[PDB]
Amino acid sequence: NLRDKATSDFVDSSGREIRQVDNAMQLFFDGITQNVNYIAAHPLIAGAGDDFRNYMGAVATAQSENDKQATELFASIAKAHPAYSYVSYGLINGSYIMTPEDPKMSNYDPRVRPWYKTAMANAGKTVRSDAYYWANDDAVLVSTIRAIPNKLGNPGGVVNIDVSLKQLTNIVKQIKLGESGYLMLMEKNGTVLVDPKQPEHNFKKLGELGDGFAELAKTGSGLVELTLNGERYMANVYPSEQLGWNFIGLIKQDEVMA
Amino acid sequence: TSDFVDSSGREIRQVDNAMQLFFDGITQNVNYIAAHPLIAGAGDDFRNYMGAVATAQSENDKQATELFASIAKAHPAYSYVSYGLINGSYIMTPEDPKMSNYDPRVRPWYKTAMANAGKTVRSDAYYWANDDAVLVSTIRAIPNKLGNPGGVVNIDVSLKQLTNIVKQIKLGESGYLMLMEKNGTVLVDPKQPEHNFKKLGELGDGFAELAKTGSGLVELTLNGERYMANVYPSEQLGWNFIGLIKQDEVM
Ligand code: PRO
Ligand code: PRO
Ligand SMILES: [Cl-]
Numbered sequence: 001n002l003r004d005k006a007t008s009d010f011v012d013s014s015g016r017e018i019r020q021v022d023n024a025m026q027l028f029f030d031g032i033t034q035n036v037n038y039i040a041a042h043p044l045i046a047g048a049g050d051d052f053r054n055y056m057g058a059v060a061t062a063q064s065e066n067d068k069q070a071t072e073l074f075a076s077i078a079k080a081h082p083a084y085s086y087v088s089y090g091l092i093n094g095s096y097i098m099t100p101e102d103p104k105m106s107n108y109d110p111r112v113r114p115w116y117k118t119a120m121a122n123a124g125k126t127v128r129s130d131a132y133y134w135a136n137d138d139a140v141l142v143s144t145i146r147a148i149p150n151k152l153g154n155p156g157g158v159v160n161i162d163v164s165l166k167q168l169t170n171i172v173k174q175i176k177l178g179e180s181g182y183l184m185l186m187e188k189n190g191t192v193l194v195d196p197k198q199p200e201h202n203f204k205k206l207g208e209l210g211d212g213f214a215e216l217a218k219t220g221s222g223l224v225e226l227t228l229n230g231e232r233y234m235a236n237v238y239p240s241e242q243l244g245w246n247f248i249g250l251i252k253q254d255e256v257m258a
Numbered sequence: 259t260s261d262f263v264d265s266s267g268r269e270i271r272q273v274d275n276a277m278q279l280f281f282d283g284i285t286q287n288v289n290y291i292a293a294h295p296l297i298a299g300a301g302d303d304f305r306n307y308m309g310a311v312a313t314a315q316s317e318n319d320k321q322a323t324e325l326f327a328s329i330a331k332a333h334p335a336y337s338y339v340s341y342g343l344i345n346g347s348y349i350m351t352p353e354d355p356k357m358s359n360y361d362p363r364v365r366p367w368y369k370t371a372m373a374n375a376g377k378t379v380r381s382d383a384y385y386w387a388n389d390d391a392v393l394v395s396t397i398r399a400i401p402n403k404l405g406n407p408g409g410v411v412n413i414d415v416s417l418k419q420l421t422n423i424v425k426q427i428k429l430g431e432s433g434y435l436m437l438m439e440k441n442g443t444v445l446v447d448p449k450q451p452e453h454n455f456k457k458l459g460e461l462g463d464g465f466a467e468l469a470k471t472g473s474g475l476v477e478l479t480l481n482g483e484r485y486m487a488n489v490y491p492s493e494q495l496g497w498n499f500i501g502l503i504k505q506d507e508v509m
Contacts (some may be wrong), residue, residue: 016430020272021503023427024279031283038332174275257288 012248049151052095055108074099091157119145119158181251266488266501301403304347307360343409344385367395371410433503
Protein backbone atom coordinates (compact mmCIF):
# COMPACT_ATOMS: atom_id res chain seq x y z
CA ASN A 1 0.00 0.00 0.00
CA LEU A 2 2.55 2.62 1.10
CA ARG A 3 5.03 0.92 -1.24
CA ASP A 4 2.35 1.02 -3.95
CA LYS A 5 1.60 4.69 -3.33
CA ALA A 6 5.27 5.66 -3.50
CA THR A 7 5.67 3.59 -6.68
CA SER A 8 2.54 4.97 -8.36
CA ASP A 9 3.67 8.47 -7.39
CA PHE A 10 6.95 7.89 -9.21
CA VAL A 11 5.22 6.43 -12.27
CA ASP A 12 2.66 9.26 -12.35
CA SER A 13 5.16 12.04 -11.64
CA SER A 14 7.84 10.80 -14.06
CA GLY A 15 5.32 10.11 -16.82
CA ARG A 16 3.80 13.56 -16.43
CA GLU A 17 7.23 15.19 -16.63
CA ILE A 18 8.47 13.02 -19.50
CA ARG A 19 5.37 13.71 -21.58
CA GLN A 20 6.29 17.41 -21.49
CA VAL A 21 9.90 16.59 -22.49
CA ASP A 22 8.49 14.52 -25.37
CA ASN A 23 6.49 17.57 -26.44
CA ALA A 24 9.58 19.78 -26.16
CA MET A 25 11.63 17.46 -28.37
CA GLN A 26 8.81 17.32 -30.91
CA LEU A 27 8.71 21.12 -31.15
CA PHE A 28 12.48 21.20 -31.62
CA PHE A 29 12.32 18.71 -34.47
CA ASP A 30 9.18 20.34 -35.89
CA GLY A 31 11.23 23.47 -36.50
CA ILE A 32 13.86 21.38 -38.29
CA THR A 33 11.23 19.57 -40.38
CA GLN A 34 9.77 22.91 -41.43
CA ASN A 35 13.17 24.24 -42.43
CA VAL A 36 13.88 21.09 -44.50
CA ASN A 37 10.57 21.75 -46.28
CA TYR A 38 11.62 25.35 -46.92
CA ILE A 39 14.95 24.21 -48.40
CA ALA A 40 13.25 21.53 -50.51
CA ALA A 41 11.00 24.10 -52.20
CA HIS A 42 13.81 26.59 -52.84
CA PRO A 43 14.52 27.27 -56.55
CA LEU A 44 18.21 26.35 -56.25
CA ILE A 45 17.25 23.01 -54.70
CA ALA A 46 13.96 22.04 -56.33
CA GLY A 47 15.49 23.26 -59.60
CA ALA A 48 18.90 21.61 -59.14
CA GLY A 49 20.50 20.04 -62.22
CA ASP A 50 23.74 18.22 -63.01
CA ASP A 51 26.25 20.98 -62.16
CA PHE A 52 26.89 20.52 -58.42
CA ARG A 53 30.31 19.35 -57.22
CA ASN A 54 30.87 15.61 -57.08
CA TYR A 55 33.16 14.30 -54.33
CA MET A 56 33.10 10.57 -55.20
CA GLY A 57 36.75 10.52 -56.20
CA ALA A 58 40.09 11.95 -55.18
CA VAL A 59 39.33 15.59 -56.05
CA ALA A 60 36.03 17.41 -56.35
CA THR A 61 34.68 18.27 -59.78
CA ALA A 62 34.66 21.95 -60.75
CA GLN A 63 32.46 24.37 -58.77
CA SER A 64 29.66 26.01 -60.77
CA GLU A 65 27.87 29.25 -59.99
CA ASN A 66 24.77 27.26 -58.97
CA ASP A 67 26.89 25.19 -56.56
CA LYS A 68 28.29 28.38 -55.04
CA GLN A 69 24.80 29.82 -54.58
CA ALA A 70 23.35 26.65 -53.04
CA THR A 71 26.33 26.32 -50.69
CA GLU A 72 25.83 29.92 -49.58
CA LEU A 73 22.11 29.32 -49.06
CA PHE A 74 22.91 26.43 -46.73
CA ALA A 75 25.70 28.38 -45.01
CA SER A 76 23.31 31.24 -44.24
CA ILE A 77 20.69 28.87 -42.83
CA ALA A 78 23.28 27.12 -40.65
CA LYS A 79 24.64 30.45 -39.40
CA ALA A 80 21.20 31.37 -38.04
CA HIS A 81 20.68 27.91 -36.45
CA PRO A 82 23.70 26.95 -34.32
CA ALA A 83 22.06 23.71 -33.18
CA TYR A 84 22.39 22.35 -36.73
CA SER A 85 25.58 20.34 -37.24
CA TYR A 86 25.28 20.08 -41.04
CA VAL A 87 22.89 21.16 -43.78
CA SER A 88 23.30 19.20 -47.00
CA TYR A 89 21.72 17.91 -50.21
CA GLY A 90 22.74 14.69 -52.01
CA LEU A 91 21.62 14.06 -55.58
CA ILE A 92 21.01 10.92 -57.63
CA ASN A 93 24.14 11.57 -59.71
CA GLY A 94 26.27 11.47 -56.56
CA SER A 95 26.77 15.23 -56.35
CA TYR A 96 26.48 16.97 -53.00
CA ILE A 97 26.05 20.42 -51.39
CA MET A 98 27.16 20.75 -47.75
CA THR A 99 27.73 23.26 -45.00
CA PRO A 100 30.19 23.61 -43.28
CA GLU A 101 31.67 23.52 -46.78
CA ASP A 102 34.52 21.09 -47.48
CA PRO A 103 35.98 21.83 -50.92
CA LYS A 104 38.60 19.10 -50.34
CA MET A 105 36.26 16.22 -49.45
CA SER A 106 37.06 12.95 -51.24
CA ASN A 107 35.70 9.43 -51.82
CA TYR A 108 32.21 10.44 -50.71
CA ASP A 109 28.97 9.27 -52.34
CA PRO A 110 25.83 10.50 -50.56
CA ARG A 111 23.76 7.80 -52.23
CA VAL A 112 25.30 5.00 -50.14
CA ARG A 113 24.63 6.73 -46.80
CA PRO A 114 21.91 5.54 -44.44
CA TRP A 115 20.12 8.91 -44.28
CA TYR A 116 19.83 8.96 -48.06
CA LYS A 117 18.42 5.43 -48.31
CA THR A 118 15.91 6.22 -45.54
CA ALA A 119 14.67 9.29 -47.38
CA MET A 120 14.33 7.43 -50.67
CA ALA A 121 12.30 4.71 -48.95
CA ASN A 122 9.99 7.49 -47.70
CA ALA A 123 10.00 9.69 -50.79
CA GLY A 124 7.85 12.81 -50.59
CA LYS A 125 7.69 12.74 -46.79
CA THR A 126 10.02 14.46 -44.35
CA VAL A 127 11.26 11.90 -41.81
CA ARG A 128 14.06 11.31 -39.32
CA SER A 129 16.91 8.87 -39.79
CA ASP A 130 18.20 6.33 -37.34
CA ALA A 131 21.26 7.63 -35.52
CA TYR A 132 24.41 7.00 -37.54
CA TYR A 133 28.14 7.64 -37.39
CA TRP A 134 30.04 10.19 -39.49
CA ALA A 135 33.70 9.19 -39.36
CA ASN A 136 35.20 12.36 -40.89
CA ASP A 137 34.39 14.36 -37.73
CA ASP A 138 33.79 11.47 -35.29
CA ALA A 139 30.13 12.42 -34.87
CA VAL A 140 26.91 10.53 -34.14
CA LEU A 141 24.09 12.30 -35.97
CA VAL A 142 20.32 12.17 -36.42
CA SER A 143 19.13 13.48 -39.81
CA THR A 144 15.86 15.09 -40.80
CA ILE A 145 15.55 14.23 -44.49
CA ARG A 146 13.26 14.61 -47.49
CA ALA A 147 13.65 13.02 -50.91
CA ILE A 148 12.49 15.50 -53.57
CA PRO A 149 12.20 15.93 -57.33
CA ASN A 150 14.66 18.07 -59.26
CA LYS A 151 15.86 18.38 -62.87
CA LEU A 152 17.76 15.07 -62.64
CA GLY A 153 14.76 12.90 -61.84
CA ASN A 154 11.84 12.21 -59.54
CA PRO A 155 13.13 11.56 -56.96
CA GLY A 156 16.28 13.54 -57.75
CA GLY A 157 17.95 14.10 -54.39
CA VAL A 158 17.64 14.26 -50.62
CA VAL A 159 17.74 17.34 -48.38
CA ASN A 160 19.28 16.72 -44.92
CA ILE A 161 19.58 18.79 -41.71
CA ASP A 162 21.83 16.90 -39.23
CA VAL A 163 21.83 17.29 -35.42
CA SER A 164 24.35 15.66 -33.09
CA LEU A 165 23.58 13.51 -30.04
CA LYS A 166 25.05 16.47 -28.12
CA GLN A 167 21.93 18.52 -28.90
CA LEU A 168 19.64 15.76 -27.67
CA THR A 169 21.66 15.38 -24.46
CA ASN A 170 21.05 19.08 -23.75
CA ILE A 171 17.29 18.59 -23.63
CA VAL A 172 17.49 15.27 -21.74
CA LYS A 173 20.25 16.03 -19.21
CA GLN A 174 18.06 18.73 -17.65
CA ILE A 175 15.53 16.31 -16.18
CA LYS A 176 16.20 15.29 -12.58
CA LEU A 177 13.89 12.66 -11.11
CA GLY A 178 14.21 13.36 -7.41
CA GLU A 179 17.83 13.67 -6.33
CA SER A 180 19.21 10.50 -7.95
CA GLY A 181 16.96 9.95 -10.95
CA TYR A 182 17.50 10.69 -14.60
CA LEU A 183 16.15 10.13 -18.11
CA MET A 184 17.52 7.89 -20.88
CA LEU A 185 16.49 8.20 -24.51
CA MET A 186 16.53 5.19 -26.89
CA GLU A 187 15.48 4.32 -30.40
CA LYS A 188 12.83 1.58 -30.57
CA ASN A 189 15.52 -0.68 -32.07
CA GLY A 190 17.44 -0.44 -28.78
CA THR A 191 20.15 2.06 -29.72
CA VAL A 192 20.88 4.44 -26.85
CA LEU A 193 20.67 8.07 -27.94
CA VAL A 194 21.25 9.73 -24.55
CA ASP A 195 22.48 8.24 -21.29
CA PRO A 196 23.26 11.43 -19.34
CA LYS A 197 24.79 9.58 -16.39
CA GLN A 198 26.98 7.10 -18.34
CA PRO A 199 27.54 8.63 -21.80
CA GLU A 200 29.77 5.68 -22.69
CA HIS A 201 26.44 3.97 -23.40
CA ASN A 202 25.63 6.42 -26.21
CA PHE A 203 25.14 4.75 -29.61
CA LYS A 204 25.26 1.25 -28.09
CA LYS A 205 22.43 -1.27 -28.02
CA LEU A 206 20.53 -1.49 -24.72
CA GLY A 207 20.31 -5.29 -25.00
CA GLU A 208 24.11 -5.49 -25.24
CA LEU A 209 24.99 -3.39 -22.21
CA GLY A 210 26.08 -4.80 -18.87
CA ASP A 211 25.04 -4.08 -15.28
CA GLY A 212 21.37 -5.00 -15.80
CA PHE A 213 20.60 -2.58 -18.65
CA ALA A 214 19.86 -5.51 -20.96
CA GLU A 215 16.72 -6.28 -18.92
CA LEU A 216 15.33 -2.82 -19.73
CA ALA A 217 15.29 -3.80 -23.41
CA LYS A 218 12.50 -6.32 -22.80
CA THR A 219 9.92 -3.77 -21.59
CA GLY A 220 7.84 -1.83 -24.09
CA SER A 221 5.96 0.41 -21.66
CA GLY A 222 5.42 1.18 -17.99
CA LEU A 223 7.01 0.27 -14.67
CA VAL A 224 9.95 -2.10 -14.27
CA GLU A 225 11.59 -3.10 -10.99
CA LEU A 226 15.19 -4.15 -11.53
CA THR A 227 18.74 -4.04 -10.26
CA LEU A 228 20.97 -1.61 -12.16
CA ASN A 229 24.64 -0.80 -11.51
CA GLY A 230 24.59 -2.81 -8.28
CA GLU A 231 21.53 -1.05 -6.82
CA ARG A 232 17.76 -1.45 -6.77
CA TYR A 233 16.05 0.82 -9.30
CA MET A 234 12.63 1.50 -10.69
CA ALA A 235 12.15 2.40 -14.35
CA ASN A 236 9.23 3.98 -16.20
CA VAL A 237 9.38 3.23 -19.92
CA TYR A 238 7.58 5.98 -21.84
CA PRO A 239 7.20 5.44 -25.60
CA SER A 240 6.97 8.50 -27.82
CA GLU A 241 4.71 7.51 -30.70
CA GLN A 242 5.54 10.60 -32.75
CA LEU A 243 9.30 10.57 -32.21
CA GLY A 244 9.60 6.82 -32.71
CA TRP A 245 11.78 6.73 -29.58
CA ASN A 246 11.43 5.52 -25.98
CA PHE A 247 12.18 7.57 -22.89
CA ILE A 248 13.11 5.64 -19.74
CA GLY A 249 12.88 7.39 -16.38
CA LEU A 250 15.17 5.79 -13.80
CA ILE A 251 15.27 6.29 -10.03
CA LYS A 252 16.82 4.50 -7.07
CA GLN A 253 14.26 2.57 -5.05
CA ASP A 254 15.86 4.01 -1.91
CA GLU A 255 14.72 7.45 -3.02
CA VAL A 256 11.20 6.27 -3.94
CA MET A 257 10.67 4.64 -0.54
CA ALA A 258 11.68 7.83 1.30
CA THR B 259 -1.53 20.91 -1.38
CA SER B 260 2.19 21.52 -0.95
CA ASP B 261 2.74 18.37 -3.00
CA PHE B 262 0.60 19.90 -5.76
CA VAL B 263 2.84 22.98 -5.89
CA ASP B 264 5.94 20.78 -6.12
CA SER B 265 4.43 18.35 -8.64
CA SER B 266 2.79 20.91 -10.91
CA GLY B 267 5.98 22.99 -10.91
CA ARG B 268 8.06 20.09 -12.23
CA GLU B 269 5.59 19.67 -15.09
CA ILE B 270 5.28 23.38 -15.91
CA ARG B 271 9.07 23.78 -15.91
CA GLN B 272 9.19 21.42 -18.90
CA VAL B 273 6.25 23.20 -20.54
CA ASP B 274 8.27 26.42 -20.20
CA ASN B 275 11.19 24.68 -21.91
CA ALA B 276 8.92 23.42 -24.70
CA MET B 277 7.51 26.88 -25.38
CA GLN B 278 11.02 28.32 -25.36
CA LEU B 279 12.08 25.83 -28.04
CA PHE B 280 9.04 26.79 -30.14
CA PHE B 281 9.90 30.49 -29.92
CA ASP B 282 13.62 29.78 -30.33
CA GLY B 283 12.86 28.39 -33.78
CA ILE B 284 11.12 31.65 -34.64
CA THR B 285 13.96 33.79 -33.29
CA GLN B 286 16.46 31.88 -35.41
CA ASN B 287 14.40 32.35 -38.57
CA VAL B 288 14.07 36.10 -37.83
CA ASN B 289 17.86 36.14 -37.66
CA TYR B 290 18.00 34.27 -40.96
CA ILE B 291 15.70 36.80 -42.63
CA ALA B 292 17.66 39.70 -41.10
CA ALA B 293 20.84 38.69 -42.94
CA HIS B 294 19.20 37.88 -46.29
CA PRO B 295 20.50 39.99 -49.22
CA LEU B 296 17.02 41.15 -50.26
CA ILE B 297 16.41 42.33 -46.69
CA ALA B 298 19.79 43.49 -45.40
CA GLY B 299 20.28 45.00 -48.88
CA ALA B 300 16.86 46.63 -49.13
CA GLY B 301 16.64 50.21 -50.37
CA ASP B 302 13.95 52.78 -51.08
CA ASP B 303 11.85 50.87 -53.65
CA PHE B 304 9.38 48.81 -51.58
CA ARG B 305 5.65 49.51 -51.65
CA ASN B 306 4.24 52.18 -49.34
CA TYR B 307 0.72 51.62 -47.96
CA MET B 308 0.35 54.88 -46.02
CA GLY B 309 -2.12 56.40 -48.49
CA ALA B 310 -5.50 55.25 -49.75
CA VAL B 311 -3.82 53.20 -52.51
CA ALA B 312 -0.49 51.38 -52.37
CA THR B 313 2.40 52.69 -54.46
CA ALA B 314 3.65 50.77 -57.49
CA GLN B 315 5.28 47.36 -56.98
CA SER B 316 8.97 47.10 -57.91
CA GLU B 317 10.91 43.98 -58.83
CA ASN B 318 12.72 43.98 -55.48
CA ASP B 319 9.36 44.24 -53.70
CA LYS B 320 8.11 41.24 -55.71
CA GLN B 321 11.19 39.17 -54.82
CA ALA B 322 11.11 40.07 -51.10
CA THR B 323 7.40 39.27 -50.91
CA GLU B 324 8.04 35.91 -52.54
CA LEU B 325 10.84 35.19 -50.07
CA PHE B 326 8.48 35.79 -47.16
CA ALA B 327 5.69 33.78 -48.80
CA SER B 328 8.02 30.80 -49.24
CA ILE B 329 9.07 30.93 -45.58
CA ALA B 330 5.47 31.24 -44.41
CA LYS B 331 4.41 28.34 -46.62
CA ALA B 332 6.93 26.05 -44.92
CA HIS B 333 5.90 27.29 -41.42
CA PRO B 334 2.10 27.06 -40.99
CA ALA B 335 2.23 28.30 -37.38
CA TYR B 336 3.47 31.68 -38.63
CA SER B 337 0.56 34.07 -39.06
CA TYR B 338 2.52 36.83 -40.84
CA VAL B 339 6.10 37.48 -41.94
CA SER B 340 6.87 41.12 -42.57
CA TYR B 341 9.46 43.88 -42.81
CA GLY B 342 8.91 47.61 -42.19
CA LEU B 343 11.44 50.28 -43.13
CA ILE B 344 12.33 53.74 -41.85
CA ASN B 345 10.79 55.37 -44.96
CA GLY B 346 7.44 53.78 -44.09
CA SER B 347 7.58 51.10 -46.80
CA TYR B 348 6.55 47.54 -45.95
CA ILE B 349 6.74 43.92 -47.18
CA MET B 350 4.19 41.40 -45.92
CA THR B 351 2.92 37.85 -46.35
CA PRO B 352 0.10 37.03 -46.76
CA GLU B 353 0.28 39.85 -49.28
CA ASP B 354 -2.51 42.44 -49.18
CA PRO B 355 -2.23 44.62 -52.30
CA LYS B 356 -5.33 46.57 -51.25
CA MET B 357 -4.10 47.59 -47.79
CA SER B 358 -4.38 51.30 -47.07
CA ASN B 359 -3.61 53.85 -44.35
CA TYR B 360 -0.84 51.61 -42.98
CA ASP B 361 2.49 52.86 -41.59
CA PRO B 362 4.58 50.10 -39.93
CA ARG B 363 6.65 52.67 -37.99
CA VAL B 364 3.75 53.48 -35.62
CA ARG B 365 3.12 49.85 -34.75
CA PRO B 366 4.05 48.26 -31.43
CA TRP B 367 6.20 45.47 -32.88
CA TYR B 368 8.26 48.04 -34.79
CA LYS B 369 8.70 50.39 -31.84
CA THR B 370 9.63 47.45 -29.59
CA ALA B 371 12.38 46.37 -31.99
CA MET B 372 13.77 49.89 -32.28
CA ALA B 373 13.88 50.10 -28.48
CA ASN B 374 15.97 46.89 -28.37
CA ALA B 375 18.48 47.45 -31.18
CA GLY B 376 21.11 44.73 -31.09
CA LYS B 377 18.65 42.07 -29.89
CA THR B 378 15.95 39.84 -31.32
CA VAL B 379 13.01 40.18 -28.91
CA ARG B 380 9.31 39.37 -28.53
CA SER B 381 6.56 41.98 -28.35
CA ASP B 382 3.73 42.13 -25.89
CA ALA B 383 0.52 40.85 -27.43
CA TYR B 384 -1.03 43.49 -29.71
CA TYR B 385 -4.14 43.92 -31.85
CA TRP B 386 -4.23 43.83 -35.67
CA ALA B 387 -7.61 45.19 -36.71
CA ASN B 388 -7.54 44.21 -40.40
CA ASP B 389 -7.92 40.51 -39.54
CA ASP B 390 -9.23 40.93 -35.94
CA ALA B 391 -6.12 39.09 -34.74
CA VAL B 392 -4.08 39.33 -31.56
CA LEU B 393 -0.42 38.68 -32.26
CA VAL B 394 2.89 38.14 -30.52
CA SER B 395 5.76 39.28 -32.73
CA THR B 396 9.40 38.21 -32.77
CA ILE B 397 11.29 41.20 -34.19
CA ARG B 398 14.76 42.53 -34.87
CA ALA B 399 15.80 46.02 -35.96
CA ILE B 400 18.41 45.74 -38.74
CA PRO B 401 20.60 47.87 -40.97
CA ASN B 402 19.87 48.18 -44.65
CA LYS B 403 20.69 50.61 -47.45
CA LEU B 404 18.50 53.35 -45.89
CA GLY B 405 20.02 53.51 -42.42
CA ASN B 406 21.38 51.73 -39.37
CA PRO B 407 18.88 50.76 -38.22
CA GLY B 408 16.91 50.90 -41.47
CA GLY B 409 13.95 48.68 -40.66
CA VAL B 410 12.48 45.86 -38.58
CA VAL B 411 11.89 42.18 -39.49
CA ASN B 412 8.82 40.53 -37.88
CA ILE B 413 7.46 36.98 -37.64
CA ASP B 414 3.98 37.11 -36.01
CA VAL B 415 2.18 34.27 -34.20
CA SER B 416 -1.48 34.69 -33.26
CA LEU B 417 -3.13 33.90 -29.94
CA LYS B 418 -5.29 31.45 -31.85
CA GLN B 419 -2.10 29.64 -32.92
CA LEU B 420 -0.73 29.76 -29.37
CA THR B 421 -4.09 28.49 -28.08
CA ASN B 422 -3.86 25.51 -30.45
CA ILE B 423 -0.47 24.68 -28.90
CA VAL B 424 -1.45 25.27 -25.26
CA LYS B 425 -4.78 23.42 -25.64
CA GLN B 426 -2.89 20.16 -26.18
CA ILE B 427 -0.86 20.48 -22.95
CA LYS B 428 -2.18 18.32 -20.13
CA LEU B 429 -1.40 18.93 -16.46
CA GLY B 430 -1.86 16.13 -13.98
CA GLU B 431 -4.66 13.88 -15.18
CA SER B 432 -7.32 16.44 -16.19
CA GLY B 433 -5.72 19.84 -15.53
CA TYR B 434 -4.69 22.53 -17.99
CA LEU B 435 -2.54 25.65 -18.27
CA MET B 436 -3.32 29.32 -18.73
CA LEU B 437 -0.69 31.64 -20.20
CA MET B 438 -0.54 35.22 -18.84
CA GLU B 439 1.35 38.41 -19.38
CA LYS B 440 2.67 39.93 -16.14
CA ASN B 441 0.31 42.91 -16.50
CA GLY B 442 -2.68 40.57 -16.27
CA THR B 443 -3.49 40.31 -19.98
CA VAL B 444 -4.58 36.74 -20.81
CA LEU B 445 -2.62 35.21 -23.67
CA VAL B 446 -4.18 31.72 -23.65
CA ASP B 447 -7.16 30.39 -21.78
CA PRO B 448 -7.57 27.04 -23.59
CA LYS B 449 -10.96 26.19 -22.03
CA GLN B 450 -12.53 29.65 -22.52
CA PRO B 451 -10.57 31.38 -25.31
CA GLU B 452 -13.03 34.29 -25.18
CA HIS B 453 -10.80 35.34 -22.26
CA ASN B 454 -7.82 35.81 -24.60
CA PHE B 455 -6.52 39.43 -24.58
CA LYS B 456 -8.81 40.35 -21.66
CA LYS B 457 -7.52 41.32 -18.21
CA LEU B 458 -7.59 38.57 -15.59
CA GLY B 459 -8.95 40.83 -12.85
CA GLU B 460 -11.87 41.86 -15.06
CA LEU B 461 -13.06 38.31 -15.78
CA GLY B 462 -14.93 38.04 -12.47
CA ASP B 463 -15.85 34.63 -11.00
CA GLY B 464 -12.66 33.05 -9.65
CA PHE B 465 -10.36 34.51 -12.29
CA ALA B 466 -10.05 37.82 -10.45
CA GLU B 467 -8.65 35.81 -7.52
CA LEU B 468 -5.77 34.64 -9.72
CA ALA B 469 -5.04 38.26 -10.66
CA LYS B 470 -3.44 39.17 -7.32
CA THR B 471 -0.90 36.30 -7.09
CA GLY B 472 2.54 36.73 -8.64
CA SER B 473 3.76 33.21 -7.85
CA GLY B 474 2.79 30.05 -6.03
CA LEU B 475 -0.38 28.49 -4.76
CA VAL B 476 -3.90 29.88 -5.04
CA GLU B 477 -7.01 28.03 -3.87
CA LEU B 478 -10.12 29.29 -5.60
CA THR B 479 -13.51 28.48 -7.10
CA LEU B 480 -13.42 28.64 -10.90
CA ASN B 481 -16.77 28.42 -12.71
CA GLY B 482 -18.41 26.92 -9.62
CA GLU B 483 -15.77 24.19 -9.10
CA ARG B 484 -13.06 24.23 -6.44
CA TYR B 485 -9.65 24.49 -8.11
CA MET B 486 -5.99 24.59 -7.14
CA ALA B 487 -3.67 26.86 -9.13
CA ASN B 488 0.11 27.19 -9.31
CA VAL B 489 1.31 30.52 -10.74
CA TYR B 490 4.67 29.79 -12.37
CA PRO B 491 6.81 32.66 -13.74
CA SER B 492 8.86 32.06 -16.89
CA GLU B 493 12.06 34.07 -16.61
CA GLN B 494 12.97 33.53 -20.27
CA LEU B 495 9.52 34.17 -21.78
CA GLY B 496 8.54 36.95 -19.39
CA TRP B 497 5.06 35.40 -18.97
CA ASN B 498 3.34 33.47 -16.18
CA PHE B 499 2.01 29.96 -16.60
CA ILE B 500 -0.94 29.15 -14.36
CA GLY B 501 -1.38 25.44 -13.74
CA LEU B 502 -4.94 24.54 -12.79
CA ILE B 503 -6.07 21.18 -11.37
CA LYS B 504 -9.47 20.50 -9.81
CA GLN B 505 -9.17 20.07 -6.07
CA ASP B 506 -11.12 16.80 -6.28
CA GLU B 507 -8.26 15.39 -8.36
CA VAL B 508 -5.59 16.74 -6.01
CA MET B 509 -7.22 15.00 -3.05
O1 PRO C 1 27.09 11.45 -42.87
C1 PRO C 1 26.93 12.03 -43.96
O2 PRO C 1 26.95 11.41 -45.05
C2 PRO C 1 26.67 13.52 -43.94
C3 PRO C 1 27.94 14.29 -44.35
C4 PRO C 1 28.03 15.46 -43.32
C5 PRO C 1 27.48 14.86 -42.06
N1 PRO C 1 26.40 13.99 -42.56
O1 PRO D 1 -0.14 44.44 -37.00
C1 PRO D 1 0.72 44.75 -37.83
O2 PRO D 1 1.13 45.89 -37.98
C2 PRO D 1 1.31 43.66 -38.69
C3 PRO D 1 0.62 43.64 -40.05
C4 PRO D 1 0.29 42.15 -40.30
C5 PRO D 1 0.03 41.63 -38.96
N1 PRO D 1 1.03 42.32 -38.14
CL1 LIG E 1 -5.92 35.76 -32.59
